[PDB]
Each structure stands twice: as C-alpha cells, then as structure tokens.
Amino acid sequence: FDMGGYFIINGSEKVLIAQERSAGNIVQVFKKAAPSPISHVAEIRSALEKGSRFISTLQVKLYGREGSSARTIKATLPYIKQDIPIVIIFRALGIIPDGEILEHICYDVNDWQMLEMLKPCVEDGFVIQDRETALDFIGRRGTALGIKKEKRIQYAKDILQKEFLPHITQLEGFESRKAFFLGYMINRLLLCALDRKDQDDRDHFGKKRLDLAGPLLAQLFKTLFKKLTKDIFRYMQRTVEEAHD
Amino acid sequence: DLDLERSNRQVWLVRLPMFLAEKWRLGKIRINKSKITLLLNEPHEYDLELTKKVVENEYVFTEQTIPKKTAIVGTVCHECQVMPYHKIVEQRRNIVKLNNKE
Amino acid sequence: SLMSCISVGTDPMPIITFLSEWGMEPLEDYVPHQSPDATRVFVNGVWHGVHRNPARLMETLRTLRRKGDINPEVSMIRDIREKELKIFTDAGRVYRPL
Amino acid sequence: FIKRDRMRRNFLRMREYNEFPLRAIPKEDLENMRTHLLKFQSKKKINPVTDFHLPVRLHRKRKTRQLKVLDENAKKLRFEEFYPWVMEDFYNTWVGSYEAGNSDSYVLLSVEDDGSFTMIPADKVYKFTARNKYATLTIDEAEKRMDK
Amino acid sequence: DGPTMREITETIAEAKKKVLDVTKEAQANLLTAKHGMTLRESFEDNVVRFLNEARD
Amino acid sequence: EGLVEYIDAEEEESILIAMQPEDLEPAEVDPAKRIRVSHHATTFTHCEIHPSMILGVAASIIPFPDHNQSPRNTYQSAMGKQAMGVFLTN
Amino acid sequence: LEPGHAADQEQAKLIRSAIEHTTLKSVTIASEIYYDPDPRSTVIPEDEEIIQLHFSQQSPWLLRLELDRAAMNDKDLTMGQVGERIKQTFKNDLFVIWSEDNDEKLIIRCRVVAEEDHMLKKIENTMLENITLRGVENIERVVMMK
Amino acid sequence: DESAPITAEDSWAVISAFFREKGLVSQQLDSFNQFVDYTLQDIICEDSTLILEQLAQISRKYEISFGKIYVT
Amino acid sequence: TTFRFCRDCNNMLYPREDKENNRLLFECRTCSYVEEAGSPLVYRHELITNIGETAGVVQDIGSDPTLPRSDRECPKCHSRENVFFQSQQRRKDTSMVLFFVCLSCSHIFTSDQKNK
Amino acid sequence: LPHFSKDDYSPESKGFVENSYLRGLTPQEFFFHAMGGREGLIDTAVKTAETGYIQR
Ligand SMILES: [Zn+2]
Ligand SMILES: [Zn+2]
C-alpha cells in the first residue's frame, strides 16, 4: 500500500510540494485606475522553451487618459532606458511607410476608430522617417557603453535581432515576422482601449502552470551544471597558466 | 561592371513538397488550357496551381564596399505551387510524427 | 481532484511541420488586404502563420488527436470570435479526462 | 441503496493540352553562378529594370591564458556577409535585405525559346527597397527638433 | 407534508415565471431603469428580490 | 480508439459538458429526489465521467456531502489529516 | 429641505436642478469639423434653415456638434442658455450659433476670428471638459427619498 | 446489445480502469521519470562545450565537452 | 475620419487650406503630392459609441456549439432555425437587446420592439 | 460553468439553489455553495485579523 512518490534524505521522507506560477509568451492587457498617465498596459513575459530561463518582459504602454487628446503609444525595450514609440520601432524593423504600419496594426480598413487613434503615433513617426535614423535613435537612447556610433547602430540592430522578443527565434532576418506580431500586440492594446474586450483575467486556471520535481530539478541541475563547467574551466586556466600537470 | 543580360526571360517560381525537392537537390509538364500537371519519370502526376497570376516587381538575378560580378537573369512570370497512390504519401506524413530520442 | 493530472510537455516541431503540408501560409507572406478572412494559427503563443480553411484543418488535427498520434496532453482551442486557434503543449497544465 | 460488492459472482456467472519536358541544367552553371530572388517594396506595380535606366549597378556596400565562447558555421558565414548590396544608376536607389525564411523549397522554371523549361534551385531570396525617394534627413537636427 | 411540498414547488415556480417575464421584458428592451442604477443592476435587484421573496 | 479525451482549463472554454449521461443525453417524478435541469442544449460535445470526482482525497471520505453544508466539509477535510489509523503494515 | 416646502416633488426637482453638476459633454452625441470658408454661406444643405434664421473676417473653419434631446430633457437645458454660457466663456473670439428646440436635430456651430483644425480641436477639449452648464462642483446622482 | 447506451453506475468501471493505470500519485512519478529521461541529457547537451584559449609567441586551444550522461 | 494616403510616399494626407481658390485640399508634407477635396468633413469624434455591439460576426457562426438556438422565424426568409446572441460591445450601459442571426440567409435581425 | 449555454440569464444557471439539504444538491449548486463557504471563511479570517489590530 506504500504509494511512494517522495524522497528520502538523511532518513527523512521529504516531499516536493507542487509550485504554481503564471504562464508566458501570451499577450496580456490590463487597466490602470491610478492617476498615472498610462491607461492600459500590454505585458508579455517572453522566454524560450528550454535553456537560459529568460526573464526579459516586453511592455507596450498607452499614454493619455480617456477624454484627453494626443494619446500616443510608447513601448519599452530591454537594455534601453526611456520608452520608445511603436512607430519608431517599426522604422527600426525595416518598415518605413506608415500605410504599411496601419496595415499591420489594424487589419480592417472599414474601422475608422483604431486608425483615428493611430494618428499621433503617425505624427511622431513622421518626425523620424528613416530606418537608419531610427537605428541611430535607439542606439543613442539606450545603452551608452557603445561610445562609437558605428558600433551602436549595428549593436542596436543586434539587440532588435536577439534580445528583442527572445521567443519565436533569435536569428537575423526575422524582422518582418516580429513586425506582424508587434502590430498584433498593438491591435490587442488599442482593441482593449476601445472597450470591445474586457481586461485580461489572471485568475483563469488555464493560464497557470504548475511545477513538480521536473522543472525544479531542471533549474537546479541547470545552474549546478553551469557552476560545474565554470569550475572545471577555472582549473584548466589555472593548469595552463601555472604550467603544471 | 554589372550588366543586364536580358531580363526578357520569363521564370516561374515553384513551392515543391519536401521529398521531391530534396530529390531535386526529370518530368514533362502538361499544360491544359487553366489546369496544368506534371508527368515525372518512373512517377506521379502533379497539378500545379496558378498561385499568383500578376507577379510584378519580382525578378531573378545571379552573381558570378566590394563590388562583385552581377548578372541579371529574367522577370518572374507567374507564381506557382505544386499540389499532389496518395495513401502512401499520407502514411509517410503520418510516419514522420514518430521521431524519438535515446 | 481525484482525476486531475499535470501535463509533462511534448515537442511542437512535428505539429508545425505537419501544418505547412496542408497549405498553412507563413507569416511573412501575409497580406491583410489579400486575405482578410484568414484564421491565425498560434503554437505556444508563437504566430507562425495563417490558414484560409480552419474547418477542415481543425477536423484533421482533431481526428489525428483522437487516434493517438498527437499526445493527448496537448490542448488545442479555437476561439471563433477572437478568430484564433491556440495550441498549448507546454508542461504545467492541469487537465482531466472526459 | 447499498454498495454492490458481489460483482465477482455476477461477472463470473455472466461471462487542348500541350506537353513540354523538364530538364536539369548541368551543375557546372550552378557552380558558376548562384541564383537569388528579387522583390521590391515600393507598391508601384510596374517598375521594370528597363525603366530603371542605365547604367544599372548592383554592388555590396598583455593578457594571459583566457576564455573564448564558441559559434557554428552557416550562421558565421551569414554573419560575416553583413554588407547589403544596392542598385543605382549614376537617380534611383534600391537597397535589398535578406529574407531567410523564404528559403525552404523554391524551384525556378525558367522558360526558354522552346516550350520546355529549365529548373534551377533557388539559393536565397532578398527584398529590395526603393531608398531615398524624398531625399531629406538630419540626425542631430532631428534629435534637437524632437525635443520641442 | 405533501401539500406543503407542493405549495413550496408552486411558490418557487411562480417566482421562476416572474424572473422569466422580467427576463423577456429586459431582452425586449421594454424596462427603463430607475435613477442611480443601470438596466443590469435593476434587473439583478428584481431577480434577487423575487428569489429571496420565494425562499422566505 | 477515440472514446475519452483529456481537457484542461483552456479547452474547457470551448466545450459543452454534460453531467449525467443517461439524464441529459436522451430527449424526453417522486418528490423525494432533487430537482435537476433540462436538456434543451443539443450541442453537447463532452460528458462528465462522474461529478463525485470533482472532490479531493480528504472530501471523498465524507458520506453524503451534498446534504451537508460546505464549511463542515472543509472542517472534516481538515480533521481527516490527523486521525488515528494504520498508515502501513511495515 | 425646509419645513415650509416639504412633501413637494417639483421644488426638490428645482433644488436638484440647482446643485447637480452638469457638463456640455453630457449632452453631446457627437461633434464634427467642417471646412466652410465663406463665413455666412454654408455648403451643408440642411443647416441652411438655421443659416436663414439665426443670421438675420472670421475663420474659414467650422466647429459643429449635436446634442441629445433626451439629455436636454433629463438635464433641463435650453440651447439658448447653453450658447449664452459659451459666449460668456470664450467672450468674442469665438462666434456661436445654436439650433432651436423645435429642430428635430440639435445643431451648434462656432468659428474664430498654421491650420485652423488644430485650434478647433483644442477648443473641443475645452468645450467638453471645462464647461459646466449648471450645478455646483462634485455633486452627482441626487436621489429623491421620502 | 453491444451497441447499447451505458448507464450512470457503469461509469464507475471506467474510473477503476483509470486508477489501475495511473495511480493516486502518478503525476510525480511521470514528471520525475521524464526529468531523469530527457531533462538530464538536455541540460548536459545544452551547455557542455567549454574551450580554453592559450596564447604563445603560435596560438593554441583546448576543449572539453560532455556527452551521454549515465545514471546508476 | 476615413483619410487617404499619398502615392509612393503612402503617408497620411494632412488637410491643406487653399486660399487662392478657397477650397479644401489634401497634402503630403514629405513630397509635393496634393489632391483635391471631395468633402468638407475632416474630423468626427462621435462620443456616444453604439457600434461594436454586433462585432465578430463570421460566415461560420452557425457551426458554434456553445451558442444557443431559438425558434423565432426570420422576417426575410422565414426560417425558424437561428442563433441569437447579445451585443458584443462590452460596457456598463450596454443594453441586453438580443441579436438574431438566421442560419439560412445570414441576416442579422434584432428583437428590439421599441426601435428597429 | 461549461455545462450551460452562453448569455444565459436564467436564475438556476446564475446561482439559485432550488433544492434542499433533505434531498441533496446538484453539482452546479454545490460548487457555488462551496464558493460561498470559502468566501465566508476568508471574510471571517480577515475580520478577525483586523479586529485584533483595532483592539490593540
Ligand atoms: Zn507623399
Ligand atoms: Zn433569415
């Protein structure tokens, strides 16, 4: 009748209680009832399926309360300090014209409301009209360790190809795909701002993920294995540097 | 010294299935006047759909600051796609879903 | 609850490979003006492309899901109003037999 | 109204056409030239290379014992070729970029004079963009003009 | 007793008919809410009031 | 053979589940039995194996928990984790 | 209330109409902007009736808006007293016209002495938010209770 | 017959055929077994390669990589 | 409100006042593309929004098992087989007026007896 | 619950328990009753936790 399903350490029967956490790689939208200038927040915790355990999270913010005009949209980027508008990021992804931007965000030409709320972002996107000036803009905005501009434009492009949206993939050339996904997130944010969809519920049990011994021992054995490799290499460098056997 | 050879050549772009494409890594196309097929060598015949009729702003070039030898081939004439004893191909497609590790 | 279990996670690669064989257009070739009524396909939150026939494709994936080819732990949802089709094969989900 | 626990005894007591051939070009021409694709991003339907005028030019623009990380092959060869090409005259500008995803399976059916066709496997595919239509910019002038 | 059980069944049944009638009048957009609340709030107050009245 | 299927909480949003099989599937009373719902819904895609399975391990020991209030089921579910008994034979 | 005016509903309706906050946005169904260069003549064929009446150097740009008659009832208002409020708000820089209560469509039009559209849009925000038609601040939903 | 509809009590049999297969605590055993089977090889193979860069004045290098892990 | 885009530039056409002929125009500030005006309307706010209540209506709406079924006949084809659902516009002041969707001609006829 | 239809405003589907403790309860009613019980326990716990601080 012994069901098993536990461990034995130092003669003690230890049990690993199932942990509970939230899921990732899902676009979420929430409201802000505080006097903050941000009205709706589009959070999305991006991470790979296996390895590294990514924590970077993308956020697309909608500024301006209801009633007031000039409600622009600005999304934050990792390693970049201040927030960057969505249209400028679209310029940095290779899409220069604005009709294509409105074609990626809103998928219905008959609807005039979303396109109407896109106007201020098309104005700031009119201020910066070039892809190279957008790459230099994100290069000058965040991460000042590049010093040189020629390395900060290519470094910013590598940020847009690697750190920007870790999921899907991290190779070069997938900027069109990420442009469509970004326009999808903006479509969900503005579509949630038009009172057509309720705030995303976090209490839905389907959006929750449990962790048994598998994931826990995966994180633990992963970190311990990394430390093991680092220590072994440390012994290698000590051996070749001190010149011994 | 880039030179456009002709560009007048008309080329058709094809999206092939993976086994025949990797096999190509000869047949006879039968144009039926708005439905065209393909009689491969023994083996199957394949209907190729007129994927995109008008296909402008698309061309084909080849290659023989660092300038290199560039040659222009021809214009793209029609966007196409090959469509498919099909039970064996369906079983092979069901059979590819059986990959495992040691 | 007495019949509740926790998923373990499978491999999404054979499913993504199987979708493109029935005409699943990639995402980079998408034009909303040439295909407005196309149903978006989502695999673990990743948008790989759309498809202009979600009925026959969904019936195929369901029939192949009931025969035992695809792991039953994978949960597939087809939101009609949202016009989406989410596919979840990640570990941690709690399911129950019915 | 009671739990039936005698199921062991109950179960024990109960049980016109036109055919044209295809051919594979010898691999010598495939070893001489690599076939790439062209796709424009200017919305204008026509835009041929004859209307692109001439001369058309497409050209590509102390420490002790330590540690290295690593990297693989094809990704490194694609990473070292980070110089995109451009086609111009002497003015229209077209600057292309890689597409990568549209590799997969792409076979070319080049039509010759006869009804037969010549199939060539596509190496890569690039998206050309018409650059510098309006002709304007600024850099620091736009960084100071955006601070108003 | 039996007759009391039938009187309870009819009591609840009458309240169910009332909630169905107010439900049809609300779906037909024939009921205007009072000042201070909306249509859904007044409808829920009427349904809850009828159910608590039948239970009491 | 395609006779039973697992369903999480995400797919549960897009299915219609029936409680009892022989009470809600076929199409059409003693006053001691409880009053149930009707079978006006036709598009039943799935059916519950048995409702008594929604309870946990501790609540399963409760006799007739339907006729008992919920907080008593919780208190009994808490006292069931400390009663004297025989855990194993070894 | 006062002991003299007790058990009276109309008096309480006057008190409620004297303290309950009301704004111009409350009565507004929609607004729209038009380019109409000639100050007097209007391209719009309907509003011509208004043009005929309310008339008998300025901005070519027109700001126009429509009110809910039900809002004009629930919150007792007069197109006249509204136009009075705006006129005594912006004073003379903004010319004003408003439709009659008899009109089955409530219309209000306004003009001014880069593009004029942006100026009008600013004035739109001021109109909706910063105008209170009647009632003292921070008072809502006055409920009659016996 | 064999094609007759089932009843409410019959469902209990199904539940039996469930607990005979899984067991009351099968999620921990399946998750742990899958961890031992695949997670070990995945963690070992995902970051096994480490190289030392040696300089001399002719360049030199060294490498250590982990392969198939073995459990006892 | 339903503005156009430039040619080649594809940028939005900001309104430009024509003081010479005194008429509205549509310009692109990047280039020199200015087209005439077919309407004096420029901006419409529309405060009280009533659209979006019937959102998300698809050709395959009749195959939804989660949706209910009614027996009321259509005013057009007179088909008693239809699927009804309330407004899709989610808001506090949204009425509970049903929306009937016939399963034959795909017509959307409501149940409001006051205003139709 | 996923056992009823969408846009259902009937009182039975919205939480009305027409059965009694003498004849048992249905699952869709026992679930809501469990929600009310857990809510009662949580509310009592919070009222006590704040009652102590107020007392001090
Ligand atoms: Zn332009
Ligand atoms: Zn009809």
Swiss-Prot record, chain A:
Domain of life: Eukaryota
One Gene Ontology cellular component: nucleus
Cellular localization per UniProt: Nucleus
GO molecular-function term, one example from the UniProt record: DNA-directed RNA polymerase activity
Keywords: DNA-directed RNA polymerase, Magnesium, Metal-binding, Nucleotidyltransferase, Nucleus, Phosphoprotein, Transcription, Transferase, Zinc, Zinc-finger
One GO process term, biological-process aspect: transcription elongation by RNA polymerase II
Further facts: The binding of ribonucleoside triphosphate to the RNA polymerase II transcribing complex probably involves a two-step mechanism. The initial binding seems to occur at the entry (E) site and involves a magnesium ion coordinated by three conserved aspartate residues of the two largest RNA Pol II subunits. Present with 18700 molecules/cell in log phase SD medium.
Summary of subunit composition and partner proteins: Component of the RNA polymerase II (Pol II) complex consisting of 12 subunits.
Family to which this protein belongs: Belongs to the RNA polymerase beta chain family.
Protein purpose: DNA-dependent RNA polymerase catalyzes the transcription of DNA into RNA using the four ribonucleoside triphosphates as substrates. Second largest component of RNA polymerases II which synthesizes mRNA precursors and many functional non-coding RNAs. Proposed to contribute to the polymerase catalytic activity and forms the polymerase active center together with the largest subunit. Pol II is the central component of the basal RNA polymerase II transcription machinery.
Gene this protein is translated from: RPB2
UniProtKB/Swiss-Prot annotation, chain B:
Family of the protein in this entry: Belongs to the TFIIF beta subunit family.
Quaternary state and interactors: TFIIF is composed of three different subunits: TFG1/RAP74, TFG2/RAP30 and TAF14.
Official protein name in the record: Transcription initiation factor IIF subunit beta
Function as written in the Swiss-Prot or TrEMBL entry: TFIIF is a general transcription initiation factor that binds to RNA polymerase II. Its functions include the recruitment of RNA polymerase II to the promoter bound DNA-TBP-TFIIB complex, decreasing the affinity of RNA polymerase II for non-specific DNA, allowing for the subsequent recruitment of TFIIE and TFIIH, and facilitating RNA polymerase II elongation.
Source organism (scientific name): Saccharomyces cerevisiae (strain ATCC 204508 / S288c) (Baker's yeast)
Note: Present with 520 molecules/cell in log phase SD medium.
Signal peptide: none
Cellular location(s): Nucleus
UniProtKB/Swiss-Prot annotation, chain D:
Gene Ontology annotations of biological process type: positive regulation of transcription elongation by RNA polymerase II; regulation of DNA-templated transcription; RNA polymerase II preinitiation complex assembly; transcription elongation by RNA polymerase II; transcription initiation at RNA polymerase II promoter; transcriptional start site selection at RNA polymerase II promoter
Organism superkingdom: Eukaryota
Post-translational modifications: Phosphorylated on Ser and other residues by TAF1 and casein kinase II-like kinases.
UniProt subcellular location: Nucleus
GO molecular function, one term: TFIIF-class transcription factor complex binding
GO cellular component: nucleus; transcription factor TFIIF complex
Key word Cell cycle present: no
DNA-binding listed as a keyword: yes
Function of the molecule: TFIIF is a general transcription initiation factor that binds to RNA polymerase II. Its functions include the recruitment of RNA polymerase II to the promoter bound DNA-TBP-TFIIB complex, decreasing the affinity of RNA polymerase II for non-specific DNA, allowing for the subsequent recruitment of TFIIE and TFIIH, and facilitating RNA polymerase II elongation.
Record note on quaternary structure: TFIIF is composed of three different subunits: TFG1/RAP74, TFG2/RAP30 and TAF14.
Leftover remarks: Present with 1920 molecules/cell in log phase SD medium.
Protein name: Transcription initiation factor IIF subunit alpha
Organism from which the protein derives: Saccharomyces cerevisiae (strain ATCC 204508 / S288c)
Upper lineage: Eukaryota, Fungi, Dikarya, Ascomycota, Saccharomycotina
Part of the intact protein present: 21 to 415 of 735
Curated annotation (Swiss-Prot), chain J:
Quaternary assembly: Component of the RNA polymerase II (Pol II) complex consisting of 12 subunits. Interacts with DEF1; the interaction is direct and serves to bridge RPB1 to the Elongin complex in a DNA-damaged dependent manner. Interacts with the Elongin subunit ELA1. Interacts with the Elongin subunit ELC1. Interacts with ASK10. Interacts with ESS1. Interacts with RTT103. Interacts with SHE2.
Gene: RPO21
Record's comment on post-translational modification: The tandem 7 residues repeats in the C-terminal domain (CTD) can be highly phosphorylated. The phosphorylation activates Pol II. Phosphorylation occurs mainly at residues 'Ser-2' and 'Ser-5' of the heptapeptide repeat. The phosphorylated form of Pol II appears to carry, on average, one phosphate per repeat. The phosphorylation state is believed to result from the balanced action of site-specific CTD kinases and phosphatases, and a 'CTD code' that specifies the position of Pol II within the transcription cycle has been proposed.
Localization per record: Nucleus
Protein name: DNA-directed RNA polymerase II subunit RPB1
Residue ranges the record marks as coiled coil: none
Organism annotation: Saccharomyces cerevisiae (strain ATCC 204508 / S288c) (Baker's yeast)
Domain notes: The C-terminal domain (CTD) serves as a platform for assembly of factors that regulate transcription initiation, elongation, termination and mRNA processing.
Family of the protein in this entry: Belongs to the RNA polymerase beta' chain family.
Region (Bridging helix): 27-39
